[PDB]
Coordinates of C-alpha atoms and ligand atoms in Angstrom, one line a residue:
Chain Y
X1 CA -83.6 235.5 -25.3
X2 CA -81.7 232.4 -24.6
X3 CA -84.3 229.4 -24.5
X4 CA -84.1 226.0 -22.7
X5 CA -82.2 227.2 -19.7
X6 CA -84.5 228.6 -17.3
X7 CA -86.2 226.0 -14.9
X8 CA -89.9 224.9 -15.1
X9 CA -90.2 225.5 -11.3
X10 CA -90.5 229.2 -12.4
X11 CA -94.0 228.0 -13.2
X12 CA -96.8 226.7 -10.9
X13 CA -98.5 223.8 -12.6
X14 CA -102.4 224.1 -12.4
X15 CA -103.6 221.0 -14.4
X16 CA -103.4 218.9 -17.5
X17 CA -105.5 220.6 -20.2
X18 CA -104.4 218.4 -23.1
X19 CA -102.8 215.0 -23.9
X20 CA -100.5 215.7 -26.9
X21 CA -98.5 213.6 -29.3
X22 CA -95.1 213.6 -27.4
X23 CA -96.3 214.8 -23.9
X24 CA -99.1 216.1 -21.8
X25 CA -100.3 219.8 -22.1
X26 CA -100.6 221.8 -18.9
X27 CA -102.1 225.1 -17.8
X28 CA -99.6 226.9 -15.7
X29 CA -98.7 230.4 -14.2
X30 CA -95.5 232.3 -14.3
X31 CA -94.4 232.7 -10.6
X32 CA -92.7 236.0 -11.3
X33 CA -95.0 237.9 -13.7
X34 CA -98.2 236.2 -13.0
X35 CA -98.7 235.5 -16.7
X36 CA -100.8 232.5 -17.8
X37 CA -99.1 230.0 -20.1
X38 CA -99.6 226.6 -21.8
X39 CA -96.9 224.1 -21.3
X40 CA -96.3 221.2 -23.8
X41 CA -94.1 218.8 -22.0
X42 CA -91.6 216.9 -24.2
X43 CA -90.5 213.5 -22.5
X44 CA -87.0 212.4 -23.6
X45 CA -86.0 209.2 -21.8
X46 CA -88.9 207.0 -22.9
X47 CA -88.1 207.3 -26.6
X48 CA -84.9 206.2 -28.1
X49 CA -84.4 208.7 -31.0
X50 CA -84.1 211.4 -28.3
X51 CA -85.8 214.7 -28.6
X52 CA -88.8 214.1 -30.8
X53 CA -88.7 215.1 -34.4
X54 CA -92.2 216.5 -34.2
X55 CA -91.4 218.8 -31.4
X56 CA -88.4 219.9 -33.4
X57 CA -90.8 220.6 -36.4
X58 CA -93.2 222.8 -34.2
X59 CA -90.1 224.6 -32.8
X60 CA -88.5 225.3 -36.1
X61 CA -91.7 226.5 -37.9
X62 CA -93.3 228.4 -35.0
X63 CA -90.2 230.5 -34.6
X64 CA -90.4 231.7 -38.2
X65 CA -94.1 232.7 -37.9
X66 CA -95.1 235.8 -36.1
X67 CA -98.9 236.9 -36.5
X68 CA -101.6 237.9 -34.2
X69 CA -103.8 234.9 -35.4
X70 CA -101.0 232.2 -35.1
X71 CA -100.1 230.8 -31.6
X72 CA -96.8 232.4 -30.0
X73 CA -94.1 230.0 -28.7
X74 CA -92.8 232.2 -25.8
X75 CA -89.9 230.0 -24.5
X76 CA -88.7 226.7 -23.7
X77 CA -87.7 225.6 -20.2
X78 CA -86.5 222.4 -18.5
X79 CA -86.9 220.1 -15.7
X80 CA -83.8 221.4 -13.8
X81 CA -81.9 218.9 -11.9
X82 CA -85.0 215.6 -17.5
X83 CA -87.7 216.9 -19.8
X84 CA -88.4 220.1 -21.8
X85 CA -91.5 222.3 -21.8
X86 CA -92.6 224.3 -24.7
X87 CA -94.2 227.4 -23.4
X88 CA -97.2 229.2 -25.1
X89 CA -99.6 232.0 -24.4
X90 CA -102.4 230.5 -22.5
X91 CA -105.6 230.2 -24.6
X92 CA -108.8 229.6 -22.5
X93 CA -110.5 227.4 -25.0
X94 CA -110.3 225.6 -28.2
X95 CA -113.1 225.4 -30.8
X96 CA -113.8 221.6 -30.4
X97 CA -114.2 222.0 -26.7
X98 CA -116.5 225.1 -26.8
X99 CA -118.7 223.5 -29.4
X100 CA -119.3 220.3 -27.6
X101 CA -119.8 222.1 -24.3
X102 CA -123.1 223.7 -25.2
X103 CA -122.3 226.7 -22.9
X104 CA -122.2 229.2 -25.7
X105 CA -123.9 230.3 -28.9
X106 CA -122.1 231.5 -32.0
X107 CA -124.3 233.8 -34.2
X108 CA -123.4 235.1 -37.7
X109 CA -121.3 238.0 -36.1
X110 CA -119.2 235.5 -34.0
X111 CA -118.7 233.6 -37.1
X112 CA -117.8 236.6 -39.1
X113 CA -115.1 237.4 -36.6
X114 CA -113.8 233.9 -36.2
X115 CA -113.4 233.2 -39.9
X116 CA -111.8 236.7 -40.5
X117 CA -109.1 236.0 -37.9
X118 CA -108.6 232.3 -38.9
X119 CA -108.3 233.4 -42.6
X120 CA -105.8 236.2 -41.9
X121 CA -103.6 233.7 -40.0
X122 CA -103.8 231.1 -42.8
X123 CA -103.0 233.7 -45.4
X124 CA -100.0 234.8 -43.5
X125 CA -99.1 231.3 -43.0
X126 CA -99.6 230.5 -46.7
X127 CA -97.8 233.6 -48.0
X128 CA -94.9 232.5 -45.8
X129 CA -94.5 229.2 -47.8
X130 CA -96.1 226.9 -45.3
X131 CA -98.9 224.4 -45.3
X132 CA -100.6 223.7 -42.0
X133 CA -102.1 220.2 -43.0
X134 CA -104.0 219.5 -39.8
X135 CA -106.7 222.2 -39.6
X136 CA -109.6 221.0 -37.4
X137 CA -111.5 222.4 -34.5
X138 CA -109.3 221.2 -31.6
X139 CA -106.4 222.9 -33.3
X140 CA -108.1 226.4 -33.4
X141 CA -107.7 228.1 -29.9
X142 CA -109.8 231.0 -28.7
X143 CA -109.1 233.2 -25.6
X144 CA -111.6 234.9 -23.4
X145 CA -110.9 238.2 -25.2
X146 CA -112.4 236.5 -28.3
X147 CA -109.0 236.3 -30.1
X148 CA -108.6 233.3 -32.6
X149 CA -105.1 231.6 -32.9
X150 CA -104.3 228.7 -35.2
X151 CA -102.2 226.1 -33.5
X152 CA -100.7 222.7 -33.6
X153 CA -97.9 223.1 -36.2
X154 CA -96.7 219.6 -35.8
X155 CA -97.7 218.5 -39.3
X156 CA -96.9 221.7 -41.2
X157 CA -94.1 221.7 -43.9
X158 CA -92.4 224.1 -46.5
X159 CA -94.0 224.1 -49.8
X160 CA -92.6 225.4 -53.2
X161 CA -94.6 228.0 -55.0
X162 CA -92.1 228.3 -57.8
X163 CA -91.6 224.5 -58.6
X164 CA -94.0 221.6 -58.0
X165 CA -92.7 218.8 -55.9
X166 CA -94.4 215.9 -54.1
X167 CA -95.4 215.8 -50.5
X168 CA -97.0 213.3 -48.1
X169 CA -100.5 212.3 -48.9
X170 CA -102.1 211.2 -45.5
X171 CA -101.9 214.5 -43.6
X172 CA -105.3 216.2 -42.6
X173 CA -107.7 214.2 -40.2
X174 CA -110.2 212.4 -42.4
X175 CA -113.5 214.5 -41.7
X176 CA -111.7 217.6 -42.8
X177 CA -109.6 216.1 -45.7
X178 CA -110.2 217.4 -49.2
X179 CA -111.2 215.3 -52.4
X180 CA -107.9 215.5 -54.1
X181 CA -106.2 213.9 -51.1
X182 CA -108.8 211.3 -51.0
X183 CA -108.2 210.5 -54.6
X184 CA -104.3 210.3 -54.0
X185 CA -102.8 213.7 -55.0
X186 CA -99.2 214.0 -53.8
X187 CA -98.4 217.3 -55.6
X188 CA -101.0 219.3 -53.7
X189 CA -101.4 223.0 -53.0
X190 CA -102.4 225.3 -50.0
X191 CA -105.9 224.6 -51.3
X192 CA -106.0 221.6 -49.0
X193 CA -106.0 224.0 -46.0
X194 CA -108.8 226.1 -47.4
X195 CA -111.0 222.9 -47.8
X196 CA -110.4 222.2 -44.1
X197 CA -111.5 225.8 -43.1
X198 CA -114.7 225.4 -45.3
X199 CA -115.7 222.4 -43.1
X200 CA -114.9 224.6 -40.1
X201 CA -117.3 227.2 -41.4
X202 CA -120.1 224.8 -42.0
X203 CA -119.4 223.2 -38.6
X204 CA -119.8 226.6 -36.9
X205 CA -123.4 226.9 -38.5
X206 CA -124.4 223.4 -37.7
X207 CA -123.8 221.4 -34.5
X208 CA -121.4 218.7 -35.6
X209 CA -118.7 218.2 -38.4
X210 CA -120.3 218.2 -41.8
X211 CA -118.7 215.1 -43.4
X212 CA -118.3 212.1 -41.0
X213 CA -117.2 208.6 -42.2
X214 CA -114.6 206.1 -40.9
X215 CA -113.0 205.1 -44.2
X216 CA -111.6 207.0 -47.0
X217 CA -114.0 205.5 -49.6
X218 CA -117.1 206.2 -47.4
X219 CA -115.8 209.7 -46.8
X220 CA -115.5 210.5 -50.4
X221 CA -119.0 209.2 -50.9
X222 CA -120.4 211.5 -48.2
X223 CA -118.6 214.6 -49.7
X224 CA -120.0 213.5 -53.3
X225 CA -123.6 213.3 -52.2
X226 CA -123.5 216.9 -51.1
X227 CA -120.8 218.6 -53.2
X228 CA -121.3 216.7 -56.3
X229 CA -119.3 213.7 -57.7
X230 CA -115.9 214.4 -58.9
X231 CA -116.0 214.5 -62.8
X232 CA -114.1 216.3 -65.5
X233 CA -117.1 218.7 -66.3
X234 CA -116.3 220.4 -62.9
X235 CA -112.8 219.3 -62.5
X236 CA -110.9 218.3 -65.8
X237 CA -107.7 217.3 -64.0
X238 CA -109.5 214.7 -61.9
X239 CA -108.8 211.9 -64.4
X240 CA -105.1 212.4 -63.6
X241 CA -105.5 211.2 -60.1
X242 CA -104.4 207.7 -59.0
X243 CA -107.7 206.6 -57.4
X244 CA -110.3 208.3 -59.5
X245 CA -111.3 205.1 -61.2
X246 CA -111.3 202.8 -58.1
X247 CA -113.0 205.3 -55.8
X248 CA -116.0 206.5 -58.0
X249 CA -118.9 207.0 -55.6
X250 CA -122.2 205.2 -55.9
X251 CA -123.7 207.7 -58.2
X252 CA -122.8 210.8 -60.2
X253 CA -124.4 213.2 -57.7
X254 CA -125.2 216.7 -58.7
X255 CA -124.0 219.3 -56.3
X256 CA -126.7 220.3 -53.8
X257 CA -124.6 222.3 -51.3
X258 CA -126.8 225.4 -51.4
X259 CA -129.9 223.2 -50.7
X260 CA -128.6 220.9 -47.9
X261 CA -127.5 224.1 -46.1
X262 CA -130.2 226.6 -46.9
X263 CA -130.3 227.7 -43.3
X264 CA -126.8 229.3 -43.8
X265 CA -127.1 233.1 -44.5
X266 CA -126.5 234.2 -48.2
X267 CA -123.0 235.9 -48.0
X268 CA -121.8 233.0 -45.8
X269 CA -123.2 230.3 -48.1
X270 CA -121.4 231.9 -51.0
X271 CA -118.2 231.5 -49.1
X272 CA -119.0 228.1 -48.0
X273 CA -119.6 227.1 -51.6
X274 CA -116.4 228.8 -53.0
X275 CA -114.3 227.1 -50.1
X276 CA -115.8 223.7 -50.8
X277 CA -115.0 223.6 -54.6
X278 CA -114.0 220.1 -55.6
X279 CA -111.3 221.2 -58.0
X280 CA -108.5 222.9 -55.8
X281 CA -107.8 225.3 -58.7
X282 CA -111.4 226.5 -58.5
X283 CA -111.2 226.8 -54.7
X284 CA -110.7 230.3 -53.2
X285 CA -107.3 231.2 -51.8
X286 CA -107.1 232.5 -48.2
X287 CA -106.7 235.9 -49.7
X288 CA -109.8 235.5 -51.9
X289 CA -111.9 234.3 -48.9
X290 CA -111.0 237.6 -47.3
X291 CA -112.1 239.7 -50.3
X292 CA -115.5 237.9 -50.2
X293 CA -118.6 239.7 -49.2
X294 CA -118.8 237.7 -45.9
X295 CA -115.5 238.9 -44.5
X296 CA -114.2 241.7 -46.7
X297 CA -115.4 244.5 -44.3
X298 CA -115.2 242.5 -41.1
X299 CA -113.0 244.2 -38.4
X300 CA -112.6 241.8 -35.4
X301 CA -111.1 244.4 -33.1
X302 CA -114.3 246.5 -33.2
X303 CA -116.5 243.5 -32.5
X304 CA -117.7 242.2 -29.1
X305 CA -116.6 238.7 -28.0
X306 CA -119.3 236.1 -27.5
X307 CA -119.9 235.6 -23.8
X308 CA -117.6 232.7 -23.3
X309 CA -117.7 230.7 -20.0
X310 CA -115.1 232.7 -17.7
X311 CA -115.4 229.9 -15.3
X312 CA -114.6 226.8 -17.3
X313 CA -111.6 226.3 -19.8
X314 CA -113.4 224.5 -22.8
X315 CA -110.6 222.4 -24.3
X316 CA -111.0 219.1 -26.1
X317 CA -109.9 216.9 -23.3
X318 CA -112.2 218.4 -20.8
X319 CA -115.2 217.9 -23.1
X320 CA -114.8 214.1 -23.8
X321 CA -114.0 213.5 -20.1
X322 CA -117.3 214.7 -19.0
Chain R
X1 CA -83.0 235.5 -32.5
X2 CA -79.6 235.4 -30.7
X3 CA -76.4 236.7 -32.1
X4 CA -74.1 234.0 -33.6
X5 CA -71.1 236.0 -34.7
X6 CA -67.9 236.8 -32.9
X7 CA -64.7 238.9 -33.8
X8 CA -61.1 237.8 -33.7
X9 CA -60.7 238.9 -29.9
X10 CA -63.6 236.7 -28.9
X11 CA -62.3 233.6 -30.9
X12 CA -59.0 233.9 -29.1
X13 CA -60.8 233.7 -25.7
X14 CA -63.0 230.7 -26.2
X15 CA -63.8 228.3 -23.3
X16 CA -61.0 226.0 -24.6
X17 CA -58.3 228.8 -24.6
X18 CA -59.4 229.9 -21.1
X19 CA -58.5 226.6 -19.8
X20 CA -55.1 226.7 -21.5
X21 CA -55.7 225.0 -24.9
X22 CA -53.2 226.5 -27.3
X23 CA -55.0 228.0 -30.3
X24 CA -53.2 225.7 -32.8
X25 CA -54.7 222.6 -31.0
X26 CA -58.2 224.2 -30.9
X27 CA -57.9 224.8 -34.5
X28 CA -57.0 221.0 -35.1
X29 CA -59.7 219.9 -32.8
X30 CA -62.3 221.9 -34.8
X31 CA -61.0 220.6 -38.2
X32 CA -60.9 217.0 -37.0
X33 CA -64.5 217.3 -35.5
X34 CA -65.7 219.0 -38.8
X35 CA -64.2 216.5 -41.2
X36 CA -65.6 213.7 -38.9
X37 CA -69.2 215.0 -39.1
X38 CA -68.6 215.4 -43.0
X39 CA -67.2 211.8 -43.3
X40 CA -69.9 210.2 -41.3
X41 CA -72.8 212.0 -42.9
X42 CA -71.4 211.4 -46.4
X43 CA -71.2 207.7 -45.7
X44 CA -74.8 207.8 -44.5
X45 CA -75.5 209.7 -47.7
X46 CA -76.7 213.0 -46.3
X47 CA -77.5 216.1 -48.0
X48 CA -74.7 218.8 -48.0
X49 CA -76.9 221.1 -46.1
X50 CA -77.3 218.5 -43.4
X51 CA -73.7 218.0 -43.0
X52 CA -73.3 221.9 -42.8
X53 CA -75.9 222.2 -40.3
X54 CA -74.3 219.6 -38.0
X55 CA -71.0 221.5 -38.4
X56 CA -72.4 224.8 -37.5
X57 CA -74.0 223.4 -34.3
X58 CA -70.5 221.9 -33.7
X59 CA -68.6 225.2 -34.0
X60 CA -71.2 227.0 -31.9
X61 CA -71.1 224.4 -29.2
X62 CA -67.4 225.2 -28.5
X63 CA -67.9 228.8 -28.0
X64 CA -69.7 227.9 -24.8
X65 CA -67.9 224.6 -23.7
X66 CA -64.3 223.6 -23.5
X67 CA -62.7 220.7 -25.6
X68 CA -61.1 219.7 -22.4
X69 CA -64.4 219.0 -20.9
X70 CA -66.3 217.6 -24.0
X71 CA -64.7 215.1 -26.3
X72 CA -64.9 216.4 -29.8
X73 CA -66.1 213.2 -31.7
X74 CA -69.0 212.6 -29.3
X75 CA -70.1 216.1 -29.9
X76 CA -69.7 215.7 -33.7
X77 CA -72.0 212.6 -33.7
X78 CA -74.5 214.4 -31.4
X79 CA -74.5 217.4 -33.8
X80 CA -75.1 215.2 -37.0
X81 CA -77.8 213.3 -35.0
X82 CA -79.6 216.5 -34.3
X83 CA -78.9 218.1 -37.8
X84 CA -80.6 215.1 -39.4
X85 CA -83.8 215.7 -37.5
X86 CA -83.8 219.3 -38.0
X87 CA -83.2 219.1 -41.8
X88 CA -85.9 216.4 -42.2
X89 CA -83.3 213.8 -43.1
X90 CA -83.2 211.7 -40.0
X91 CA -80.7 208.9 -39.2
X92 CA -80.9 206.5 -36.4
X93 CA -78.4 207.2 -33.6
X94 CA -77.3 203.6 -33.9
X95 CA -76.2 204.1 -37.5
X96 CA -74.3 207.2 -36.7
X97 CA -72.5 205.1 -33.9
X98 CA -71.5 202.2 -36.3
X99 CA -70.2 204.6 -39.0
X100 CA -68.2 206.4 -36.2
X101 CA -66.8 203.1 -35.1
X102 CA -65.9 202.3 -38.6
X103 CA -64.1 205.6 -39.2
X104 CA -62.3 206.1 -36.0
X105 CA -59.3 204.1 -34.5
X106 CA -59.6 202.5 -30.9
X107 CA -58.3 205.5 -29.0
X108 CA -60.5 208.0 -30.9
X109 CA -63.6 205.9 -30.5
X110 CA -62.6 205.5 -26.7
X111 CA -64.2 208.9 -26.4
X112 CA -67.6 207.3 -26.5
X113 CA -66.9 205.2 -23.5
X114 CA -68.9 202.0 -22.5
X115 CA -72.2 203.0 -23.9
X116 CA -71.7 205.1 -27.2
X117 CA -75.4 205.7 -28.0
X118 CA -76.1 206.9 -24.5
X119 CA -73.3 209.4 -24.5
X120 CA -74.7 210.8 -27.6
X121 CA -78.2 210.9 -26.3
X122 CA -77.4 212.7 -22.9
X123 CA -75.3 215.3 -24.8
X124 CA -78.3 216.2 -27.0
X125 CA -80.0 218.1 -24.1
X126 CA -77.0 220.2 -23.5
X127 CA -76.5 220.7 -27.3
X128 CA -80.1 222.0 -27.6
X129 CA -79.6 224.3 -24.7
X130 CA -76.3 225.7 -25.9
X131 CA -77.6 226.5 -29.3
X132 CA -80.5 228.0 -27.5
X133 CA -83.0 226.0 -29.5
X134 CA -82.3 228.1 -32.7
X135 CA -82.3 225.2 -35.2
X136 CA -82.7 226.9 -38.6
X137 CA -79.4 227.7 -40.3
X138 CA -78.6 228.7 -43.8
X139 CA -75.2 227.9 -45.6
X140 CA -73.2 229.4 -48.3
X141 CA -74.1 226.8 -51.1
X142 CA -77.7 228.2 -51.9
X143 CA -76.1 231.8 -52.1
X144 CA -73.2 230.7 -54.3
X145 CA -75.7 229.1 -56.7
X146 CA -78.1 232.1 -56.7
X147 CA -75.4 234.6 -57.4
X148 CA -73.5 232.7 -60.0
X149 CA -76.9 232.0 -61.9
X150 CA -76.8 235.8 -62.7
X151 CA -73.4 235.8 -64.1
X152 CA -73.4 235.8 -67.9
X153 CA -70.3 235.6 -69.9
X154 CA -68.8 232.3 -70.5
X155 CA -70.8 229.0 -69.6
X156 CA -67.7 226.9 -69.2
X157 CA -65.6 229.4 -67.0
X158 CA -68.5 230.1 -64.9
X159 CA -69.0 226.4 -64.2
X160 CA -65.3 226.2 -63.2
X161 CA -65.8 229.0 -60.9
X162 CA -68.9 227.4 -59.3
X163 CA -67.2 224.0 -58.9
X164 CA -64.1 225.3 -57.2
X165 CA -66.0 227.8 -55.0
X166 CA -68.1 224.9 -54.0
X167 CA -64.8 223.1 -52.9
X168 CA -63.8 226.2 -50.9
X169 CA -67.2 226.2 -49.1
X170 CA -66.5 222.7 -48.0
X171 CA -63.0 223.9 -46.8
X172 CA -64.4 226.9 -45.0
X173 CA -66.6 224.6 -42.8
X174 CA -63.3 223.3 -41.0
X175 CA -62.6 226.8 -39.7
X176 CA -64.3 229.3 -37.5
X177 CA -65.5 231.3 -40.6
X178 CA -69.1 230.5 -40.0
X179 CA -68.8 232.0 -36.6
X180 CA -67.4 235.2 -38.1
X181 CA -69.4 236.1 -41.3
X182 CA -72.9 235.5 -42.7
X183 CA -73.2 232.7 -45.4
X184 CA -73.8 235.3 -48.2
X185 CA -70.5 236.9 -47.5
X186 CA -68.7 233.5 -47.4
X187 CA -70.4 232.6 -50.7
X188 CA -69.0 236.0 -52.3
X189 CA -65.7 235.3 -50.8
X190 CA -65.2 231.8 -52.4
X191 CA -66.2 233.1 -55.7
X192 CA -63.7 236.0 -55.3
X193 CA -61.0 233.4 -54.4
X194 CA -61.8 231.0 -57.3
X195 CA -61.8 234.0 -59.7
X196 CA -58.3 235.0 -58.6
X197 CA -56.9 231.6 -58.7
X198 CA -58.5 231.0 -62.2
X199 CA -57.5 234.5 -63.4
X200 CA -61.1 235.2 -64.1
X201 CA -62.4 238.8 -64.3
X202 CA -65.8 238.3 -62.7
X203 CA -66.9 242.0 -63.4
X204 CA -67.0 241.1 -67.1
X205 CA -69.9 238.7 -66.5
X206 CA -72.2 241.4 -65.0
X207 CA -74.2 244.3 -66.3
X208 CA -71.5 246.8 -65.0
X209 CA -68.2 245.4 -66.4
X210 CA -66.1 248.5 -65.8
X211 CA -66.8 248.2 -62.1
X212 CA -64.0 246.0 -60.3
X213 CA -66.2 245.7 -57.1
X214 CA -68.6 243.1 -58.8
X215 CA -70.0 241.8 -55.6
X216 CA -72.0 244.9 -54.4
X217 CA -74.8 243.6 -56.7
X218 CA -75.3 240.5 -54.3
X219 CA -74.3 241.9 -50.9
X220 CA -74.1 245.3 -49.3
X221 CA -71.2 247.1 -47.6
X222 CA -68.6 244.3 -47.8
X223 CA -65.0 245.8 -48.2
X224 CA -62.4 244.1 -50.3
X225 CA -60.3 243.7 -46.9
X226 CA -62.9 241.3 -45.4
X227 CA -62.9 239.2 -48.6
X228 CA -59.1 239.0 -48.6
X229 CA -59.2 238.1 -45.0
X230 CA -61.6 235.1 -45.7
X231 CA -59.3 234.0 -48.5
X232 CA -56.3 233.9 -46.2
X233 CA -58.1 231.8 -43.7
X234 CA -59.3 229.4 -46.3
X235 CA -55.8 229.4 -48.0
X236 CA -54.3 228.6 -44.7
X237 CA -55.6 225.0 -45.0
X238 CA -53.2 224.5 -47.9
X239 CA -50.6 225.6 -45.3
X240 CA -47.2 224.6 -46.7
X241 CA -48.5 221.3 -47.6
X242 CA -51.7 219.6 -46.5
Ligands
ADP1 N1 -101.6 227.4 -26.1 C1 -102.6 226.7 -25.5 N2 -103.5 227.1 -24.7 C2 -104.5 226.2 -24.3 N3 -104.6 225.1 -24.6 C3 -103.8 224.5 -25.5 C4 -102.7 225.3 -26.0 N4 -102.1 224.5 -26.9 C5 -102.6 223.3 -27.0 N5 -103.6 223.3 -26.1 C6 -104.5 222.3 -25.8 O1 -103.9 221.0 -26.0 C7 -104.5 220.3 -27.1 C8 -103.4 219.7 -27.9 O2 -102.4 220.6 -28.4 P1 -102.0 220.6 -29.8 O3 -101.0 221.6 -30.0 O4 -103.2 220.6 -30.7 O5 -101.2 219.2 -30.1 P2 -101.7 217.8 -30.5 O6 -102.9 218.0 -31.2 O7 -100.6 217.5 -31.4 O8 -101.7 216.9 -29.4 C9 -105.3 221.2 -27.9 O9 -106.4 220.7 -28.5 C10 -105.6 222.2 -26.9 O10 -106.7 221.9 -26.4
MG2 MG1 -103.7 219.2 -32.4
MG3 MG1 -100.9 217.4 -33.8

């Protein structure tokens, strides 16, 4: 109802489960209802432009978005006596944590479900005119019921689907950043979020992230050596990009994606291929990913969850600590 | 989402009236606060939507707090400061304070006390709580442009209508109109007022010219009476003089 006014001592604080941009992230429990929540703390006195514009962003966008596969901001409370706390439904894990835990195995059917849910959320989020711009595993939460929620909307923004106007270039973390960004596109599309998810899909089938470098040039090289070199034959508009000439990879590699990942099942591989098209205009939409063979018929509610550790909340922070 | 609209009875029982502030003095306090927000943001070169968002926070703030307890210019600065962040057009609080110093006289700026920046920063917590963290707001400008763009008769008269109605939206922001009616409705009202002052028959610019109630194409269930009411409130700012 009326947010920001109830006191944070309505909650019992259990522990720090995340360190965040503008504050620590806590696991806590509602003292009245017994509900589990996550608290993102917002410190105010340290910073001199007051309440963090990034928290303002998450608040503005999350309030507009209501979907079963997008994290819900329940309310906002305060230290009553002074910081604010953003309150979310508690999610037992995130994907980065689970993966680096080695406490679970995701087979094809788990992957079927995760990708189905993640894609329905992104489609909803794209059909509301928002880009996420920071899709990666630590930003995908999973509860013990096996439900996926897309989270961390701190870098999201409105985009125009009628007009074409310019947006910030440095937006997605590098290992999940698409070729058009790496070549300097500023008038980009929701296709940049699909590329990210394509990386998630591969990363769920293999152990680690699929393209790992430490600089943009080396990153584009890694991409190229598997996805093929950017060139007009597969991507006519590539020549219109600022860094196409300066960032040409070592060779003109031919695409070898279906070879380098032959362990991935056929239906999945087709999706993987289609999500990792170099040319964003050839890349599937979220809606198209969902019409593909791999996800078309998939109904997550009628599928059993993987057996997730009920005794250990596998979040990014916990993993890199141990 | 909360409810942000009050009737006439409610507006006559604001926290400022309850503490004995006369209606005329509260009306002047809101004008002054609103024009102050408008003038500071303009000198900082801010988007008209950013000014409007600031002013709407301002009008909402004083449905919950009294002017006798919260000096109006400090709140004004706080609301513009917050609006900038919300509308993705940030200005440093230090810039808002200098501009405020520039535009106010000594007594007026006295409101900010010994540490002007820190009076703004502490108010921001209270502001955010009062507006219930409902940050997103829409204004009549966008609807005025959307509706006028579907009018078809005379390119020149239509532009005169839009320009003058635009000015009335600016005026309307100095009044509690945004606490009374949705932006769409205000947008229709300023078109209606401009049309009458310009002796324009707006019906004739639509697909149904024989129908005097031309606005039903844009908004549902708005009686003439409400439009005339909005007109009188706006016209009151051109009071005898002014
Ligand atoms: N609702 C939640 N439930 C459980 N853990 C969460 C929740 N939200 C965030 N976390 C944990 O906190 C971490 C950081 O939160 P996030 O929203 O991603 O912000 P940021 O990445 O900007 O710091 C996430 O990786 C996740 O592990
Ligand atoms: Mg994150
Ligand atoms: Mg983030």
